[PDB]
């Protein structure tokens, strides 16, 4: 039983998941004076098929938009990778108020939310289940979301939430290309890290975009109005779901720019 409350939250996760104190934990604070530019990093290349969009689900602590992952219709390539990675999900993290909510921070600056677009290594592994615990198994793009003007690209996502208000509800979510949510520039930082919540596997190559995307105060309010309880129980809004940043433990954050 993990969550984001005071008793089951990030600071207690290590009791059930000792890897929470590991050497490749995420998120991290990116100190830009300590990043190392790497001339070998190629540009990020995403090519997603909107027909792979499948379902939106309320998972209690968050909501997920999942994608069909039976073939290479929707892939991420380039950057630090020599393998192609298959899209399987995107989701967001947010905080209790606008002042925080992102997971990664840049030079100590906290943003209001963060988008995660997750992929698994289909060149090397046969399924997400096999890839999920492998050091080279997962690739996640993180986009920092800065509070400001309403972001119209979020519209379909936001409009879908009324059908998945409570824990366990799910609905079709089709014909959507999440590359439309990415910033204009794909300049990025990369470092070896982990899932940011249990099971916290140290299996993620992180791709953190330099450019933020916008989100309005009211759009964030829609996230926070999702309910963590099951239908019929007392309503418990999903106020936050961002993990604090974790020690780099000697890792190097590389920059593509
Ligand atoms: N971008 S991220 O915030 O680091 C991120 C991306 C993907 C997954 C998670 N963590 C969870 O889903 N934890 C709950 C278990 N749900 C089942 C399950 C699904 C996928 C994977 Br892989 C492992 C796994 O056990 C975090
Ligand atoms: Zn995430």
UniProtKB/Swiss-Prot annotation:
Localization, UniProt: Cytoplasm
Primary localization class, coarse: cytoplasm
Record: residues binding substrate: 196-197
Residue numbers binding Zn(2+) 1: 91, 93, 116
Region of interest (Disordered), ranges: 1-27, 237-257
Superkingdom assignment: Eukaryota
Regulation: Activated by histamine, imidazole, L-adrenaline, L- and D-histidine, and L- and D-phenylalanine. Inhibited by coumarins, sulfonamide derivatives such as acetazolamide, benzenesulfonamide and derivatives (4-carboxyethylbenzene-sulfonamide, 4-carboxyethylbenzene-sulfonamide ethyl ester, 4-(acetyl-2-aminoethyl)benzene-sulfonamide, 4-aminoethylbenzene-sulfonamide), and 'prong inhibitors' BR15, BR17, BR22 and BR30. Activated by a short exposition to Foscarnet (phosphonoformate trisodium salt), but inhibited by a long one. Esterase activity weakly reduced by cyanamide.
GO cellular component assignments: cytoplasm; cytosol; extracellular exosome
Residues bound to Zn(2+) 2: 61, 64, 197
Enzyme Commission numbers on file: 4.2.1.1, 4.2.1.69
Active site: 61
Matches recorded under InterPro entries: CA_dom, CA_dom_sf, Carbonic_anhydrase_a-class, Carbonic_anhydrase_a-class_CS
Domain Alpha-carbonic anhydrase: 1-257
GO terms of molecular function: arylesterase activity; carbonate dehydratase activity; cyanamide hydratase activity; hydro-lyase activity; zinc ion binding
Keyword entries, A-Z: Acetylation, Cytoplasm, Lyase, Metal-binding, Zinc
Function in brief: Catalyzes the reversible hydration of carbon dioxide. Can hydrate cyanamide to urea.
Family named by the database record: Belongs to the alpha-carbonic anhydrase family.
Annotated PANTHER family: CARBONIC ANHYDRASE (PTHR18952), CARBONIC ANHYDRASE 1 (PTHR18952:SF282)
Protein's recorded name: Carbonic anhydrase 1
